[PDB]
Amino acid sequence: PLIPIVYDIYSRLLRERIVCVMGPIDDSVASLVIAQLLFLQSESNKKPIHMYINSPGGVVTAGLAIYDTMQYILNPICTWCVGQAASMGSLLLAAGTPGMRHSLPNSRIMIHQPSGGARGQATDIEIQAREIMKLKKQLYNIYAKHTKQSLQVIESAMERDRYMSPMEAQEFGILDKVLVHPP
Amino acid sequence: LIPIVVYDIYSRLLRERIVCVMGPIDDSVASLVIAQLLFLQSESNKKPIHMYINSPGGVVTAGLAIYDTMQYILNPICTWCVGQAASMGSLLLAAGTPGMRHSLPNSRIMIHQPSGGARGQATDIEIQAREIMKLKKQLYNIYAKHTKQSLQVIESAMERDRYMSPMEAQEFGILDKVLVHPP
Amino acid sequence: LIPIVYDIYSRLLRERIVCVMGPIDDSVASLVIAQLLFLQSESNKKPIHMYINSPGGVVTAGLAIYDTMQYILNPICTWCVGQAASMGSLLLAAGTPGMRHSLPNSRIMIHQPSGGARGQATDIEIQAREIMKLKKQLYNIYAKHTKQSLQVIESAMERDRYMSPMEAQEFGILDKVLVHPP
Amino acid sequence: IPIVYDIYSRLLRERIVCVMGPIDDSVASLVIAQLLFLQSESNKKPIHMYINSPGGVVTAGLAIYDTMQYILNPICTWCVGQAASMGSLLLAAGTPGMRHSLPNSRIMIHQPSGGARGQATDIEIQAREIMKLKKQLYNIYAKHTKQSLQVIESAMERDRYMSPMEAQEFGILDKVLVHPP
Amino acid sequence: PLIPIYDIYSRLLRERIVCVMGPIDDSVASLVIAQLLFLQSESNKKPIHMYINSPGGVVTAGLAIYDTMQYILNPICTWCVGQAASMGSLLLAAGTPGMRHSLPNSRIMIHQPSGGARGQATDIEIQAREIMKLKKQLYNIYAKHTKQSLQVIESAMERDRYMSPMEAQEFGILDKVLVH
Amino acid sequence: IPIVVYDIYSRLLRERIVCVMGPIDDSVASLVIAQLLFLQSESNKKPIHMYINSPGGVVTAGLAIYDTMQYILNPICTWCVGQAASMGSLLLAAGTPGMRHSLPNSRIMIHQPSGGARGQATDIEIQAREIMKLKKQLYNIYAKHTKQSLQVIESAMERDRYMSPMEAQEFGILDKVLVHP
Amino acid sequence: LIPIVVRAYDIYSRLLRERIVCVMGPIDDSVASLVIAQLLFLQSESNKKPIHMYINSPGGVVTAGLAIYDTMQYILNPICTWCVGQAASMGSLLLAAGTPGMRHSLPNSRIMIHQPSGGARGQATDIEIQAREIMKLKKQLYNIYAKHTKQSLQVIESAMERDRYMSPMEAQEFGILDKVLVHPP
Amino acid sequence: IPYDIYSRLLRERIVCVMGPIDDSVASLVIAQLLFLQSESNKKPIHMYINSPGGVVTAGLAIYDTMQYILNPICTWCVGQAASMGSLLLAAGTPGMRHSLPNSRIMIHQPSGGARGQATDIEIQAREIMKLKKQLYNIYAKHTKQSLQVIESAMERDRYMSPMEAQEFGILDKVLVHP
Amino acid sequence: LIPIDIYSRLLRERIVCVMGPIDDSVASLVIAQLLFLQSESNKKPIHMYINSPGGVVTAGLAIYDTMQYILNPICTWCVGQAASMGSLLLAAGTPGMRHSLPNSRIMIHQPSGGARGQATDIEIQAREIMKLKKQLYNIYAKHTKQSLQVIESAMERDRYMSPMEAQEFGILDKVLVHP
Ligand SMILES: CC(C)C[C@H](NC(=O)[C@H](Cc1ccccc1)NC(=O)c1cnccn1)B(O)O
Ligand SMILES: CC(C)C[C@H](NC(=O)[C@H](Cc1ccccc1)NC(=O)c1cnccn1)B(O)O
Ligand SMILES: CC(C)C[C@H](NC(=O)[C@H](Cc1ccccc1)NC(=O)c1cnccn1)B(O)O
Ligand SMILES: CC(C)C[C@H](NC(=O)[C@H](Cc1ccccc1)NC(=O)c1cnccn1)B(O)O
Ligand SMILES: CC(C)C[C@H](NC(=O)[C@H](Cc1ccccc1)NC(=O)c1cnccn1)B(O)O
Ligand SMILES: CC(C)C[C@H](NC(=O)[C@H](Cc1ccccc1)NC(=O)c1cnccn1)B(O)O
Numbered sequence A: 001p002l003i004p005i006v007y008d009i010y011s012r013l014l015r016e017r018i019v020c021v022m023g024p025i026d027d028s029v030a031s032l033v034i035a036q037l038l039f040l041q042s043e044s045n046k047k048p049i050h051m052y053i054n055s056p057g058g059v060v061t062a063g064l065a066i067y068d069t070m071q072y073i074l075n076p077i078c079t080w081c082v083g084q085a086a087s088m089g090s091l092l093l094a095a096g097t098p099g100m101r102h103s104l105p106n107s108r109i110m111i112h113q114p115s116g117g118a119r120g121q122a123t124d125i126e127i128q129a130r131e132i133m134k135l136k137k138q139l140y141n142i143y144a145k146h147t148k149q150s151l152q153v154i155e156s157a158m159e160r161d162r163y164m165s166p167m168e169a170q171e172f173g174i175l176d177k178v179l180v181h182p183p
Numbered sequence B: 001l002i003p004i005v006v007y008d009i010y011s012r013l014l015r016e017r018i019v020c021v022m023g024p025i026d027d028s029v030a031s032l033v034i035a036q037l038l039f040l041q042s043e044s045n046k047k048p049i050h051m052y053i054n055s056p057g058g059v060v061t062a063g064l065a066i067y068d069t070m071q072y073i074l075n076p077i078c079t080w081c082v083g084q085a086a087s088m089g090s091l092l093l094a095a096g097t098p099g100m101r102h103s104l105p106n107s108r109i110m111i112h113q114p115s116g117g118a119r120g121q122a123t124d125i126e127i128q129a130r131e132i133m134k135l136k137k138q139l140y141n142i143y144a145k146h147t148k149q150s151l152q153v154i155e156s157a158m159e160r161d162r163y164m165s166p167m168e169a170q171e172f173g174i175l176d177k178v179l180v181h182p183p
Numbered sequence C: 001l002i003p004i005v006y007d008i009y010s011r012l013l014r015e016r017i018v019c020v021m022g023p024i025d026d027s028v029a030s031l032v033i034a035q036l037l038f039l040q041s042e043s044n045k046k047p048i049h050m051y052i053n054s055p056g057g058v059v060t061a062g063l064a065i066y067d068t069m070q071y072i073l074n075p076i077c078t079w080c081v082g083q084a085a086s087m088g089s090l091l092l093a094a095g096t097p098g099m100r101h102s103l104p105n106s107r108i109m110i111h112q113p114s115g116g117a118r119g120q121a122t123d124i125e126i127q128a129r130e131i132m133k134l135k136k137q138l139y140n141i142y143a144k145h146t147k148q149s150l151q152v153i154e155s156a157m158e159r160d161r162y163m164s165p166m167e168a169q170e171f172g173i174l175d176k177v178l179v180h181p182p
Numbered sequence D: 001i002p003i004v005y006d007i008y009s010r011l012l013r014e015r016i017v018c019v020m021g022p023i024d025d026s027v028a029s030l031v032i033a034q035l036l037f038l039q040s041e042s043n044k045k046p047i048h049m050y051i052n053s054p055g056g057v058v059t060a061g062l063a064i065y066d067t068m069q070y071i072l073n074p075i076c077t078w079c080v081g082q083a084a085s086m087g088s089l090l091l092a093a094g095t096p097g098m099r100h101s102l103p104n105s106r107i108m109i110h111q112p113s114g115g116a117r118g119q120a121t122d123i124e125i126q127a128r129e130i131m132k133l134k135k136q137l138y139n140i141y142a143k144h145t146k147q148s149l150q151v152i153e154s155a156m157e158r159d160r161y162m163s164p165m166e167a168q169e170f171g172i173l174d175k176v177l178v179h180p181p
Numbered sequence E: 001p002l003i004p005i006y007d008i009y010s011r012l013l014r015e016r017i018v019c020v021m022g023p024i025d026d027s028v029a030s031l032v033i034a035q036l037l038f039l040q041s042e043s044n045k046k047p048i049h050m051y052i053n054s055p056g057g058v059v060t061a062g063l064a065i066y067d068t069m070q071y072i073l074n075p076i077c078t079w080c081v082g083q084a085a086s087m088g089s090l091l092l093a094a095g096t097p098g099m100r101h102s103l104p105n106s107r108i109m110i111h112q113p114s115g116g117a118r119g120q121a122t123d124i125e126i127q128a129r130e131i132m133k134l135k136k137q138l139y140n141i142y143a144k145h146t147k148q149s150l151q152v153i154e155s156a157m158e159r160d161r162y163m164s165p166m167e168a169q170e171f172g173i174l175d176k177v178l179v180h
Numbered sequence F: 001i002p003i004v005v006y007d008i009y010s011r012l013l014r015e016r017i018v019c020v021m022g023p024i025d026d027s028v029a030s031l032v033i034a035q036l037l038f039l040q041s042e043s044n045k046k047p048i049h050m051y052i053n054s055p056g057g058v059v060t061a062g063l064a065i066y067d068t069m070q071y072i073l074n075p076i077c078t079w080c081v082g083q084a085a086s087m088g089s090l091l092l093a094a095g096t097p098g099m100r101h102s103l104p105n106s107r108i109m110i111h112q113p114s115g116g117a118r119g120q121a122t123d124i125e126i127q128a129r130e131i132m133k134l135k136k137q138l139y140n141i142y143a144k145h146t147k148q149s150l151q152v153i154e155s156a157m158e159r160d161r162y163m164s165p166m167e168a169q170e171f172g173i174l175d176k177v178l179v180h181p
Numbered sequence G: 001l002i003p004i005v006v007r008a009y010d011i012y013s014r015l016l017r018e019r020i021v022c023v024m025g026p027i028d029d030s031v032a033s034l035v036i037a038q039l040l041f042l043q044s045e046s047n048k049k050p051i052h053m054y055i056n057s058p059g060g061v062v063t064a065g066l067a068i069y070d071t072m073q074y075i076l077n078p079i080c081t082w083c084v085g086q087a088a089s090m091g092s093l094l095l096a097a098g099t100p101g102m103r104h105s106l107p108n109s110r111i112m113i114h115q116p117s118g119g120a121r122g123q124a125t126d127i128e129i130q131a132r133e134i135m136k137l138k139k140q141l142y143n144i145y146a147k148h149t150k151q152s153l154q155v156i157e158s159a160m161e162r163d164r165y166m167s168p169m170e171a172q173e174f175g176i177l178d179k180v181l182v183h184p185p
Numbered sequence H: 001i002p003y004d005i006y007s008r009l010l011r012e013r014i015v016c017v018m019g020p021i022d023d024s025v026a027s028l029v030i031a032q033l034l035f036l037q038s039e040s041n042k043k044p045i046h047m048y049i050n051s052p053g054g055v056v057t058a059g060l061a062i063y064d065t066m067q068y069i070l071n072p073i074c075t076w077c078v079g080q081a082a083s084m085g086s087l088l089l090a091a092g093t094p095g096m097r098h099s100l101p102n103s104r105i106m107i108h109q110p111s112g113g114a115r116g117q118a119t120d121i122e123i124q125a126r127e128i129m130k131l132k133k134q135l136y137n138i139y140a141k142h143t144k145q146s147l148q149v150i151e152s153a154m155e156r157d158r159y160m161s162p163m164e165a166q167e168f169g170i171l172d173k174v175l176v177h178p
Numbered sequence I: 001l002i003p004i005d006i007y008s009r010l011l012r013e014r015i016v017c018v019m020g021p022i023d024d025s026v027a028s029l030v031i032a033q034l035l036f037l038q039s040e041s042n043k044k045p046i047h048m049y050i051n052s053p054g055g056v057v058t059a060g061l062a063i064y065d066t067m068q069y070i071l072n073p074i075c076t077w078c079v080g081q082a083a084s085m086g087s088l089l090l091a092a093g094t095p096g097m098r099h100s101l102p103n104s105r106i107m108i109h110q111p112s113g114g115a116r117g118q119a120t121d122i123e124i125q126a127r128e129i130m131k132l133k134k135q136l137y138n139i140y141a142k143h144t145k146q147s148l149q150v151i152e153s154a155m156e157r158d159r160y161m162s163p164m165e166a167q168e169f170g171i172l173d174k175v176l177v178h179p
């Protein structure tokens, strides 16, 4: 129910170098996750950081803030897909350190192109549409960077909502290990 | 309510070959106006039709439906700006037969680029944005056709909201005569 | 429910009486203008009686009625009944000179135009200039029919100026304050 | 509604049917009732159908379409303003050679949209039916535009906007006339 | 685009045509039954045309229309236009045998009755029992006019079942699928 | 409402047919009683047909129709079409004996009156005592026309009782369950 | 509010010290996070001591309940599931996910199993994608139930097509739980 | 709230079950009962009940927790104990169910709702009937009454004074002063 | 959660505040404070300050039974107002220890409620609200030393009383200004 006291249960996991990225991802969640990552880098810039992801997606800018912080900090980051990693969650899941992107057997991974809105005069419509297209190409480049897939494959896969099992997402290159029990 | 005679007041004006295009222009207003223009052409394809305009604007497709009907019917059309002819209302005012576009002294004319919205995936956003840009060039061409203005001048004038007196609109080419009393 | 004599307003329209009562929007402007054109078609010489009981309304809608009044050849006897505020007082003073009447207990209010604007700073300035253009335009119309200088029109309409029928006759808004028929 | 009866009843005397605004079961009822009434008056005289619709219900539009094809009268469709979604289907459903459009109209074609809710079995049934309508509407478009099913699927997969000339090239309409010839 | 002029449906009623389009409730049932009775009093032998474009509606109102169809002596030609779902499909199959028609691009949907119940457990059992009676009642009506087994009706109407005009003709809902 | 050449219900009122369909309130009671008085003035001997498709309604409104039914001298043929629940079943049984019919697939529901009470404890007693009077009063009316004992009425109408047309014929609510005349 | 036991903490913290995780109420991404966080905390304290999981849930999101499921299967600690009040929808799957022989239920609890429900909206291509994903989850949850109930996939499909309600003894015969206990044995 | 007072009473082995009963209230009560058992599985647990009722599944969760823990449970009806509250009042240890003089006890059959297709409607109705028999058997167990009298009493809303409930078997002692 | 709480400081001085509308939540807090004050000392008096316009009948009877159960003499003080159930708890104080400030007001009236459902249900609820009417009338008659007729006539409608009027009626004992 309430945040359990051991401090809150998440503060105890932060001591174990575990960051939870669960639920929709907005600027608020982006601020908390970037703050925990920076604190964990200041504690030790070599120890790994475990990032547990159970997110249905969220704002593009907020997730890209989390993504760049993950690539900036020197600590290896072990991403763990738990439950689901959809939309921005799947980008963060694939953004883990090579070889350390894991997923539980019954998770699901979803990738798709950005969605958004535009309103105003025709000039403002074109500026907003030009920007959301830049985001579409930008995220396609990020996915192709980490999945090591060709941009053609990324374009064809993320044009509509694409659902993947943990084995399928490993075959696509989004994750590296589908483990039931710990080896 | 609609006053009666010995029909409604607008029906009596429809007998006088007068069509009232007042208020915002949607598909319902376009239906009634086009129906009156077709009725008035069947009665006489030579007698002029007086179209009184007091509109702040409305749907682009509905206003373009009225515009094409005006250009299709063989009857000369005397457009009269009463009160205001803004947005699509100003296009219908300029769509009148040359030399037959009138305006009362204290009316105002407003011209501006089309506005709208777009929501969905990035591919859809581009589709709506490209379509609203097509309408922007299309409406600029219609204004440049009847105002005898260069397409650049139309772009520069309708980028923001541009308000004009009846004389400023006559100099612009939207209307032909500004009359206080009938000559 | 409109009493069926048709409706009582139609019976008065046959008597060349147009009622401009209530707030003035594009809808009221359409009906009033339509009634004025019908009455001009029936006779471009017979006078038209315009009864005004308005608290005001949209500027463009009232200016449509004003221009239609000035365009048609028929003399227009404007009667202020109840109140004539904002655009109502303008239509009251817009009647044919010497035919702008008022009842003894009516009131007349004149004030500067009001409105709003929203958007970017460029849009805000465009709307602000336009509402100032309307302000000068309406002030000139008042100065035209009240026979007043622009100085007096600006000073009076800066705030809400309420006038008795005598005060509006002195100011030039109306011409006759009658209790009983002439 | 002006009185002449209503202005639409006067155009119905001239054998004109207005299909403007969104298309639902109510609009389909009025349109079908006028078409049947116009066929009873004369099964040989043509019927002019003016369209200014952004689309509407699939079932209601297919009711109008089947009534158009059933009646023996030739039907001249006129795209005024816009004919989007079901409206463009009715525009193409006109008699071959009698599908017209005003110069500044626009025509939009897209695949059907809908929703589904319930158990996983219910979701599957609604999805199969939404796919049957997708293939059914694609076959109707390919029939009247004389286009291959390949081109219909590729065009109607996303929202496709066409000028009156582009729709004349695609086979949606036959003539784009400014002034009457 | 607004009740064309009397109303176009009154002109069709002179031609013995009754329109049953839209959802079906006590109001639609009242109008349809009134038109059918008027058409019987005018001529109790002339056929009555019943155009159906309904997504369904209230069971009681639809059974009111069904019983009036069976009671009046006039043959009834049911025409599936656009769609005939839920109760609309029952009225379509309620027509005089051999006079149930459908346009080429119509669709026919059959499913078991849906509803709600609220109150004490004793009450809950009462409405649920009444709901089941309607389920068996409608299953028997469908089997009567479709010439199908009660097993076929239960299997088909257990979930929402969507049919083309040819499929509904094979199932027995309608008789003729017009085409051009 | 379709128009003959007036509304379809007025044409049925010429045929001495009164429609009691939908919920029953003071407005529906006012129209039904006004038609019954008009039909008695036309002829106090010709029968009056009353078609009932009601889920019930206000108690006082339904008892107003009931008392009007009992007052006029015209034999009343009540017909249960679709359903006749709550007050609808009472007016169905209120028909002239031997002339209360029901179509084969209709349903008839009987239950005790429902209501609400709010205020001070004294006001709660006044309102609760009144609704008990309505329960005995309606039970006595049902026992009068159904030829059933008051015990059977109390046992049946304590909860919602649903009856087929044949079940209601045996209970005494209606007289004939006809399919084709 | 949450009672305090005296440091200081809530009553659920005291039960967490006793290695008791409460999964009560609807199961969403927020509940899944707290449950998974407590399970990992309990595993770091001792990867051999058993973890007691009390379940009183009417169900919830599929992805969240599967997040709890996979975490239970991942951690090495034996997990004793206890069905208290009700274990419906995803709650019943979490009841059967306990360590074999350690799935308990109180006498008056009830267990409910059914197929996943959802919704879909958009273009026909979108609708077809959502419907397929909803069917994948249906076969996936059927496979999980068949795994832990030791039932054939045929029985699972036939049972979970509609809402199936069970007594604690009925779920023990089906294989959802292991022992129905009144008082402590 | 003035730690909190309910924590002070929990130290005195007092669990307050007041207000409507849902899954949240059931979780807190069960958590307090388990903590009190871990402190001492022999000392009694006082359960003060002032509830107009609530969810069946939640109240059954509290009841089974009361029957599972070894501690004798002293139930006290204060203000009122209606619907599920009366069951938890009767769920007390035999001879340890008390009630204040001006308390109120109400018993009635379960209420609920159902919606969906006819097949679903039946499934819900059959389940709400199972809960009806289940709660009837639980009431018949602690009140030492036949199942037939339980159906008849709980068919409609039945209100009882503290002495009437003691007669029915819901509680044991009606005290004014200790 | 305002001053550093002031009510905990008053509870140390054996003061229980019963102010605002009375529901099951206010009853739970008041009863818990009374039980805590009895555990500290079953002889020292408990001061109960009442500023309530009334509330739920069952909640007010819970507080009343808790007042009568505990052995501590309870000093009830009518501050501001003591209406509906607030007047019952004011009269529920230990005889001779029911006080009131000079400018307070005390209101007594019959119970109010509502009922909805079938006629059978409507009667069951109406029968119960009548039981509560007699029950509260007997409680008021017990502590005010008044006859049942005086209770019925006074509480049939809303009856407002000054502290002196409530002292003569038997609701309180002392009307003090400056102590
Ligand atoms: C495709 C991946 C990168 C992101 C997906 N989400 C988005 O694209 C989100 C979904 C959204 C957010 C706010 C309002 C409406 C919709 N789209 C955007 O963030 C966005 C941002 N700027 C312009 C237009 N859209 B998914 O839900 O994480
Ligand atoms: C600019 C002149 C030529 C015409 C103007 N019409 C419009 O702006 C209208 C009114 C409108 C409708 C929806 C949202 C925003 C605005 N815009 C459109 O019709 C429209 C059509 N397609 C895409 C986007 N906007 B005016 O009548 O406001
Ligand atoms: C000042 C006299 C001459 C006319 C007055 N009319 C107006 O003030 C009207 C009524 C109005 C409408 C919207 C918001 C506020 C007010 N104002 C306008 O018409 C208006 C027009 N353009 C820009 C801003 N306001 B009065 O209220 O009739
Ligand atoms: C694609 C063309 C042929 C027809 C289009 N019609 C529809 O999309 C319509 C309108 C609609 C309804 C809900 C959600 C979105 C849209 N869709 C349907 O009629 C419909 C019918 N059955 C199942 C699902 N959708 B158009 O008129 O928008
Ligand atoms: C299944 C076919 C034969 C008939 C279908 N009709 C119904 O299911 C209708 C639609 C409806 C009406 C009111 C409240 C809830 C639901 N269901 C009922 O009439 C109904 C009857 N009794 C109890 C509960 N619902 B269809 O027209 O949706
Ligand atoms: C029981 C049969 C005879 C009549 C039934 N009617 C009632 O129970 C109705 C339900 C109702 C309807 C509208 C507004 C308020 C209450 N009961 C009453 O009208 C009513 C009126 N006064 C006191 C008590 N009940 B049925 O239509 O539910």
Ligand SMILES: CC(C)C[C@H](NC(=O)[C@H](Cc1ccccc1)NC(=O)c1cnccn1)B(O)O
Pocket: G058, G059, G060, G061, G062, G063, G088, G089, G090, G091, G093, G114, G115, G116, G117, G118, G119, G133, G134, G137, G141
């Ligand atoms: C059937 C058992 C296995 C699980 C059930 N869960 C669901 O039905 C849940 C309820 C839910 C949650 C969030 C949003 C929408 C719907 N369904 C889903 O999670 C879900 C997931 N993907 C597609 C469609 N529905 B139960 O907890 O109702």
Ligand SMILES: CC(C)C[C@H](NC(=O)[C@H](Cc1ccccc1)NC(=O)c1cnccn1)B(O)O
Pocket: H052, H053, H054, H055, H056, H057, H082, H083, H084, H085, H108, H109, H110, H111, H112, H113, H127, H128, H131, H135
């Ligand atoms: C009869 C006693 C045992 C319980 C009474 N309450 C119930 O039965 C409650 C009433 C209720 C009220 C609001 C929201 C949800 C449910 N019903 C249930 O718990 C319930 C449980 N399963 C199926 C159907 N209903 B009482 O009012 O607490």
Ligand SMILES: CC(C)C[C@H](NC(=O)[C@H](Cc1ccccc1)NC(=O)c1cnccn1)B(O)O
Pocket: I053, I054, I055, I056, I057, I058, I060, I083, I084, I085, I086, I088, I109, I110, I111, I112, I113, I114, I128, I129, I136
């Ligand atoms: C008259 C004095 C003695 C008591 C007064 N209390 C009441 O009237 C209270 C107000 C109330 C509270 C909760 C829910 C409904 C109504 N009445 C009842 O508690 C109540 C209880 N059962 C049946 C009818 N009314 B007063 O407002 O405190």
Ligand SMILES: [Cl-]
Pocket: A070, A071, A072, A073, A074, A075, A076, A077, A097
């Ligand atoms: Cl890194």
Ligand SMILES: [Cl-]
Pocket: C069, C070, C071, C072, C073, C074, C075, C076, C096
């Ligand atoms: Cl003039």
Ligand SMILES: [Cl-]
Pocket: D066, D069, D070, E104, E178, E179, E180
């Ligand atoms: Cl066809």
Ligand SMILES: [Cl-]
Pocket: D068, D069, D070, D071, D072, D073, D074, D075, D095
């Ligand atoms: Cl044809």
Ligand SMILES: [Cl-]
Pocket: E069, E070, E071, E072, E073, E074, E075, E076, E096
């Ligand atoms: Cl027949």
Ligand SMILES: [Cl-]
Pocket: F069, F070, F071, F072, F073, F074, F075, F076, F096
């Ligand atoms: Cl009679």
Ligand SMILES: [Cl-]
Pocket: G072, G073, G074, G075, G076, G077, G078, G079, G099
């Ligand atoms: Cl494990």
Ligand SMILES: [Cl-]
Pocket: H066, H067, H068, H069, H070, H071, H072, H073, H093
């Ligand atoms: Cl025990």
